[PDB]
Structure formats: C-alpha cells, structure tokens
Structure 1
Amino acid sequence: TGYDLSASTFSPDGRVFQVEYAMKAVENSSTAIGIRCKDGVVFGVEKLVLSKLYEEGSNKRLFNVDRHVGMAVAGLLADARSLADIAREEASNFRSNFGYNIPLKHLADRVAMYVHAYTLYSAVRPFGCSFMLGSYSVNDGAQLYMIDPSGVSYGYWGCAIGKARQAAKTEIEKLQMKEMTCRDIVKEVAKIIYIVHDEVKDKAFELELSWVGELTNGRHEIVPKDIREEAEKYAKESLK
C-alpha cells in the first residue's frame, strides 16, 4: 500500500484513490432524483426519518442557490452546504460585475473548477458530495447539470444520485420527459421513489419535492402542499 494516502500521488496503474474513496461515501446518502420536463425542471428527494425527535422540515437536502437556480445534494451534508455557499456567492459576483442572471453552462463550470481544485494537493481532501443543478430561463429553456466529487459535469434529461442509482434511473427512461409539462411530472417523480427503498431498511421516510419553470414564473420554490398530497395520494397505487 502507501499509494492511496494523499491526493497528490497516482497509483502504479495511474488513478487516484482518494477521489474514488470519496465517491464511495456518496452511496451511503439516500437518493436524490431530478428530471426536467418540457418546460421546467422538477427535483425530488426522499428523506429518511431517523428518529421521531427530529422536526418535520429539518436539515433539508434541497437548497436554493439563486433566484432561478436550484440544488439537490447527496453526500456528507457539511460539505454539501459548504459547496452551496460558494455557488450562492459565485452567482452574486456575476450579477454585480456583468449585470444579469448567471447561465447554467457558466455556473456549473465555475463550481466544478472549484471542486476540481481540491483533487490536486496533499493539504486538502476531495469533497464527499455529488449534487444536481437545475433551472429555467425564458431565453434558454430548462437546464439540468450534475457534478461528481471529481469535478466532471454533464447535461441530463434526468439523473439520480444516492444509494440506489441504477435502480432509480432504470425507471426514469420509462418516462417521456420530452413532451410532458411540469404538472403530471410531479406525480411521476414521486412514484419512482416509492418503488425504491424497501420497508425492511427504513421504517418511515419523508417526501420532499422541488419545482421550477415558467409555471413558477422562473423563480425556484418548493411545491405547494396540495400538489404533493396528490402525489402522496398517488403513492399506494403501486401495489397492483
């Protein structure tokens, strides 16, 4: 051994294990999925009720970076909201210097170069978080990006991060996200995260949904209660 202690050393076959070890820490966080509809992006996070003593609305794994940009995280939660602070701060420097709202192909570029910068030195560790960025503009449409702890970003029609990643994105491609608007998506977002996480592992869990598009007039916010109650009404019909 000895070839895997620092992030400054390659292996004798040419790969870095400190990044791969931090990628393994993501699959112990639960599940965060997000797909984009024809005219907007819908996030979705199932939230484990660890004990009864916590309060409904605690420790949200679903942030709010800018007025139109949303973030759903998966990983070590202290590093999640630390990456959320620099992304919230990066968009403020764009509007102050250039005058207008930051686009997603630039925002996820500036954040991923900040994540990549900790995969080079021995003085710092790689982050233990993977997360998704989605938004809607009236001149660019809906956007959906995703960033690993190594620093690689791509566009997606729908993605999934958490424990059951392949077992979640198997059913995403059963949908048709090219033509559905962001109303019937909300019922289909919830349904594919009820079929995952058998009740042997967890007793009870919490649904948390997010929502952006021109139906929300460009601003990012949470779903209302009645709409996610319709999805929770559309929960127990997967037993047939």
Structure 2
Amino acid sequence: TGYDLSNSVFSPDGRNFQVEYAVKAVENGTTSIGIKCNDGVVFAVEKLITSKLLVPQKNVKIQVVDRHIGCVYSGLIPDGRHLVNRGREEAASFKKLYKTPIPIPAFADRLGQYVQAHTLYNSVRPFGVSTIFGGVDKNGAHLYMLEPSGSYWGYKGAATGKGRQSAKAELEKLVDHHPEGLSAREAVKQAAKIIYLAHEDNKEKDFELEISWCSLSETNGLHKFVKGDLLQEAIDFAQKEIN
C-alpha cells in the first residue's frame, strides 16, 4: 500500500487513487446539470442558502467563456474558477491566431488536456470538480461533461454533484419521450424542474435556482443568464411539478 498517497502513481489495479479521491469532492458538491436542446444548450445549478445573510442572486456560479460558451461545475468552487480562467486563455489564443471563435469540441479538448496534465505529476493535485459546459458553434449545439481524470464525452443531457442519480433519471426520461428534440424554452423549464427534484438529496437547507442558456434562435448563439420573468416562469413550472 501507499499507492494512494501520491498523485500519478499507478496502483496494482492500474488506478490513480488520487483522481478517485478528487471525485469524492465532486460528489460532495451541489447539483449542476446541462441539457442539449434543438438549437442550443441550457445550464442550471443548485445554490445552497447556508444563511439568510447571503445576498440573493449575487454569488453567481455559472461562468461564461468567450461569448458563446457556458460553464458550470460541482465540487471545489475555486478549482472550477481556475479551470475557467485557463479555458478563457485557451479561447483567446485560439481566436487570436485563427480569428473564428473556438469551436465547442476544440474547447472541450483544451480543458481536457489541461485537466489530464494534472494527473501526470506528484507535484500537482487533480481538479476537485466535474465541469458541465458547452454552447453553439458553426456545426450547431454541443454539450460536454469533464471529470477530474481529464475524461470527457459529448452528452444529450448531463448531471453531477450530490443529486446526480436523481437528475440523470429525469434526463433519461426526456431523451426517451423526445426523440425529435426539445425546444430551448422547454429545456429551461425542464432544467428548473430537475434541479428542484434533485434538491431532495440536499433537503436540509433551502436553495436558490440559477439558469443560463445559449440558443441560435433565442440568444443569437450567445451565452446569457435566465433572468426576471423567464426565470420566475421556470420556478413556477418547477414548483407545480413537485406538488
């Protein structure tokens, strides 16, 4: 034994236990999801209200990269911010050299290679976050989810955090019942419901819902936060479904 004391060490199984321990920090975090719709993507996250003293709508969790990519994560929040800062540097250098905004699959690999690099040495710690991200490019909508190992795939729907099992089950129903697809406005409504349903795993404290979206028709392919009337409409739809 001792194989789990140092990052980048293979156990006799062929496993990197330090990466697996980073996953435990992710599983401890709040629930975040992503939904791929007809011409874009929707992101949503559970924000635990630890106290009444928290200013509502101020501690924003979802982050924008460039102007067309949204990023949300569960686990160690600072680690997620560090990853998004890198993502922003990657997107800037891509656009600087190639002019066009970074495509989503291209952006996904940039994050992937950087996270994977933190599994190669014992002088660094793996990322304590799973990141759900995506947006619209020239080839349409893309949704990705990235793990501490550096592993990522494309998704129809994605979920991570403490209430991921509940969320996944809900996402699987939407995929089955809508083979033709889901509209952007529908996806926002469904995203609200799923976070509310996933909040049963974090039922002790009450929470605040935060949603964002990129859609070709609804936001001109730019990342925007769901605010005001559209947010309230989604909250009402969500509250109606849990009762």
Is the structural similarity TM-score above 0.5? yes
User: Cα gap change, 1:53/1:13 in structure 2, threshold over 3 Å: closer, same or farther?
Assistant: same
SS of 1:130's equivalent? Answer: strand
Aligned counterparts, 1:1-240, within 5 A: 1-137=1-137, 139-175=138-174, 176=178, 178-198=180-200, 201-214=203-216, 215-240=218-243
> TM-score of the superposition, structure 2-length normalised?
0.93
Q: Deviations over 1:163-205 (max 9, x none)?
A: 0212111011211274221012211111122122238733311
Distance in 1 (CA, whole Å) between partners of 2:127 and 2:135 is: 23
User: Cα gap change, 1:55/1:149 in structure 2, threshold over 3 Å: closer, same or farther?
Assistant: same
> TM-score of the superposition, structure 1-length normalised?
0.94
Q: Deviations over 1:185-238 (max 9, x none)?
A: 211111122122238733311010001111101111101310111111113322
Once the 2 structures are TM-superposed, how far is the Cα of residue 96 of structure 1 from its aligned partner? 0.7
User: Cα gap change, 1:173/1:85 in structure 2, threshold over 3 Å: closer, same or farther?
Assistant: same
* CA RMSD after TM alignment: 1.5
Cα contact 2:197–2:242 (8 A) shared by 1? no
Distance in 2 (CA, whole Å) between partners of 1:124 and 1:156 is: 29
Distance in 1 (CA, whole Å) between partners of 2:238 and 2:186 is: 14
Aligned length: 239
Cα contact 2:166–2:197 (8 A) shared by 1? no
SS of 1:173's equivalent? Answer: helix
Give the gaps of 5 or more residues in structure 2: none
Cα contact 1:19–1:150 (8 A) shared by 2? yes
Q: Which deviates more from structure 2 when the two are superposed, residues 103-112 or residues 174-183?
A: 174-183
Q: Which deviates more from structure 2 when the two are superposed, residues 42-51 or residues 192-201?
A: 192-201
Runs of 4+ with deviation above 3 angstroms: none
Give the gaps of 5 or more residues in structure 1: none
Matched-pair identity in %:
51
